[PDB]
Write a protein that binds this ligand. Structure first.
Ligand SMILES: Nc1nc2c(ncn2[C@@H]2O[C@H](COP(=O)(O)OP(=O)(O)NP(=O)(O)O)[C@@H](O)[C@H]2O)c(=O)[nH]1
Ligand SMILES: [Mg+2]
Length: 267
């Protein structure tokens, strides 16, 4: 039924474009029309909702788009609006439970997974992103990705991925899937995280087939082709393979911890 995700990261990393790519993926039975217009810089936090379907199963997918950070001289406390929105949904869910005349089914607007966009510098994790991820992973599931990965070669993607994984362990950033016998499947996923993804809101004719891609002066970058980028790995993780596992952790771990602290401090 319901599933909510949110894109977070530095400004100019294709977060808004990735929102359109998730809804326009050719895996679903139908897609919204092609955009064909430059998306302006996101100034306000806003959520998009649409019902997608695959294999006859409908899903009410909600994606929250956020304004990018990291453009000021001093970016201190730039995580407050995003952390505030995450806790706002936990408070809404709690107030719906304690309502004396509460409805049968509680509307769930809690963020079930956060997609964190990392700049494709090719070096290591930035101190600004380290501070952001450490605060994020305490309250929400986080899956990091290498944004606009076509700016790096395949060799550069892998070397950058390994260096990101090194300082993730060094700074104790437990991203999803957390380490807490199917370890072989999650080890394969943790090997590829952060995914090297590419966004696209346009359809192009390549090899006689209509596919999503970015048209440049040298070729078409097919975003749903594993030979070009790893967007199918992110799409299958969020929507297909680990959808319920993300919701179970959000309700039983993250929201439960928020609810316990809220009720204990009120006696
Ligand atoms: N090379 C490349 N460019 C991309 C990709 N995705 C988006 N872009 C381009 O990058 C620019 C910024 O896109 P946008 O989605 O607005 O970024 P944003 O993170 O939403 N910015 P903001 O957070 O400030 O709103 C646009 O020109 C867009 O076409 C990608 O995968 N690769
Ligand atoms: Mg944007």
């Amino acid at each position: 039924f319901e599933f909510n995700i949110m894109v977070v990261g530095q400004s100019g990393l294709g977060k808004s474009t990735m929102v359109n790519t998730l809804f326009k993926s050719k895996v679903w039975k139908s897609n919204p029309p092609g955009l064909g217009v430059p998306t302006p810089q996101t100034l306000q936090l806003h959520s998009l909702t649409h019902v997608i379907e695959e294999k006859g199963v409908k899903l009410k997918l909600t994606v929250t788009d956020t304004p990018g950070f990291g453009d000021q001289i001093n970016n201190d406390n730039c995580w407050d609006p995003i952390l505030g929105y995450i806790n706002e949904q936990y408070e809404q869910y709690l107030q719906e439970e304690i309502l004396i005349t509460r409805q049968r089914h509680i509307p769930d607007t809690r963020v079930h997974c956060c997609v964190y966009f990392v700049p494709p510098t090719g070096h290591c994790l930035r101190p600004l992103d380290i501070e952001f991820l450490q605060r994020l992973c305490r309250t929400v599931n986080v899956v990091p990705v290498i944004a606009r990965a076509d700016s790096l070669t395949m060799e550069e993607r892998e070397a950058f991925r390994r260096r990101i994984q090194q300082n993730l362990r060094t700074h104790c950033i437990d991203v999803y899937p957390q380490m807490c016998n199917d370890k072989i499947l999650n080890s394969k996923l943790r090997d590829r995280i952060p995914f090297a993804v590419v966004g696209a809101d346009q359809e192009h004719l390549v090899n006689g087939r209509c596919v999503l891609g970015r048209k440049t002066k040298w070729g078409i970058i097919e975003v749903e082709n594993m030979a070009h980028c790893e967007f199918p790995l992110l799409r299958d993780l969020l929507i297909r393979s680990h959808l319920q596992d993300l919701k179970d952790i959000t309700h039983n771990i993250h929201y439960e911890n928020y609810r316990v602290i809220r009720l204990n401090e009120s006696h």
